[PDB]
From a paper:
The [name] triphosphohydrolase inhibits HIV-1 infection of myeloid and resting T cells by depleting dNTPs. To overcome [name], HIV-2 and some SIVs encode either of two lineages of the accessory protein Vpx that bind the [name] N or C terminus and redirect the host cullin-4 ubiquitin ligase to target [name] for proteasomal degradation. [name] is a dGTP/GTP-activated deoxynucleotide (dNTP) triphosphohydrolase (Amie et al., 2013; Goldstone et al., 2011; Ji et al., 2013; Miazzi et al., 2014; Powell et al., 2011; Zhu et al., 2013) involved in balancing cellular dNTP pools (Franzolin et al., 2013) and regulated by Cyclin A2/CDK1-dependent phosphorylation (Cribier et al., 2013; Kretschmer et al., 2015; Pauls et al., 2014; White et al., 2013).
Here, we report the crystal structure of the ternary complex of SIVmnd-2 Vpx bound to the N-terminal region and SAM domain of mandrill [name] (SAMHD1mnd-NtD) and the WD40 domain of the cullin-4 substrate receptor [name] ([name]-CtD). SIVmnd-2 Vpx comprises an N-terminal extended arm that precedes three α helices. The side chains of amino acid residues H35 at the C terminus of helix α1 together with H78 and C83 at the C terminus of helix α3 constitute a zinc-binding motif that links the helices together, similar to that observed in SIVsmm Vpx (Schwefel et al., 2014). However, in contrast the fourth zinc coordinating ligand in SIVmnd-2 Vpx is a water molecule rather than an additional cysteine C-terminal to C83 as occurs in SIVsmm Vpx. These are (i) a Vpx-[name] interface on top and side of the [name] propeller, (ii) a combined interface between the N-terminal extended segment of [name]-NtD, [name] and the Vpx on the side of [name], and (iii) contacts between the SAM domain and Vpx on top of [name]. One feature of this interface is a “trapped” region where the Vpx N-terminal arm wraps over [name] packing it against [name]. Comparison of Vpx/[name]/[name] ternary complexes reveals that this discrimination of [name] N- and C-terminal degrons by the two classes of Vpx is determined both by polymorphisms in the [name] amino-terminal region and by specific sequences in the VR1 region of Vpx.
Residue numbers in the entry:
A (entry chain C): 1 to 22, 34 to 88, 93 to 109
B (entry chain B): 2 to 85
C (entry chain A): 1075 to 1315, 1327 to 1392
Amino acid sequence: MQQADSDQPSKRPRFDDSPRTPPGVELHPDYKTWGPEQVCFFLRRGGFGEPALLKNIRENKITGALLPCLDESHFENSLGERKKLLSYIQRSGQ
Amino acid sequence: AERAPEAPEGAGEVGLEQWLETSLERINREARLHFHPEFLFRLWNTCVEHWHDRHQRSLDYAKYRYLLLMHKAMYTHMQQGCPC
Amino acid sequence: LIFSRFRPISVFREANEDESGFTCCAFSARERFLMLGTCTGQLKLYNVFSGQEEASYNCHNSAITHLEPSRDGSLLLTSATWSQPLSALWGMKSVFDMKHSFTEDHYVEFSKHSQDRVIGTKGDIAHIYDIQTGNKLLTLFNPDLANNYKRNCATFNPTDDLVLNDGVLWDVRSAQAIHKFDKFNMNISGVFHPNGLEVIINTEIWDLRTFHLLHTVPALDQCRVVFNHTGTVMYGAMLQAKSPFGSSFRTFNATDYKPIATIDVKRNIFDLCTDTKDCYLAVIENQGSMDALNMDTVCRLYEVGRQ
Ligand SMILES: [Zn+2]
């Protein structure tokens, strides 16, 4: 009796019922067009989604065009991480 | 008095996983026709950074909350009037 | 002028969700129920008196944008946002089943006098369907006269003689355009006054007999307009061309088009509706933020008359 294409689960995901036990769409082809939001997705895929870093990316309105021009002193404003991030951005696709 | 009709047989049967990913696929394709990726990523990033990372919820819960936000955004936009 | 006072008395939330996502509301045929549509396609019936969720149905794969029960409680029309089928007709009498779908029609409504027909809208085209068979009875489209309104909703006049579609006036039994109303906005296509005498397109109020302009009413700009059962008052809530929904609704007098009140609910209004006895006003309210995260949307019930 129920149309299977309009059907939904009866159980809805609830916060207090959904603990973590331990992608969706794609970026623009050229880095230059990225807003700070697309830059944050990019940074998170590299393992650099420290909540402080992405906050600065947003406050300082750092775009994708800007993203190649940066240094570890910027990244301070955890020396080992800054080296990896600097390396990540270097070796990347766009 | 006024009675409310019985639910159809078979309502609620579909699994979360299957429903979630089919939904995410459909709305994402559709949204890309109406929104610029910055907006799309603004909804995705908040949901994942907030529900998945800070509040340590499953990715499925985060995706589910993104789904809810995209639906409402699609709703707003089409009520406003779509050029195409 | 009792439509100057509204007292919030009740609130409805989705009972099984962290965040409510009502997108639509309509009282049931016999007004025992508030029918609330949700942003994922569900329909939910709340008992107005008890306040409890009495039923839940799965209707579409996108947000519900419109709900119209038939006066006889036999049928329900629904519309979605972007998922096909966009509209559908449902049975209401024993089991909830889909009678017919209108795949490409993003808005539907019953004929007014005898509710035996459904008029649907696909862009600039209006379709008229028979309720029993679901067959398309006719297609109203005149390419020459089109205004191309972005929010076009075709609609029957009170007596089902006439159709307003994309700012064009159609005579139903000859199936021919008899007047194009000139275009003064991009979005609102317009509506019949319940008195069957005037047409309200956006700001402009036209006279059907003479096609002379009667009033221009700047307050109505981009407002979704709603008449009370007796045709004495229109409610109005903006949806502009940060959230585009107005934070407030204005009531007017339907005879002289003069303001009566300007009510601020301090929340984004997604939709509103009112019962026939003019006791209650239900308003879908959304928590506006520059913050994407907060999109909790509830239905607040108002008592009209009471401060
Ligand atoms: Zn669009």
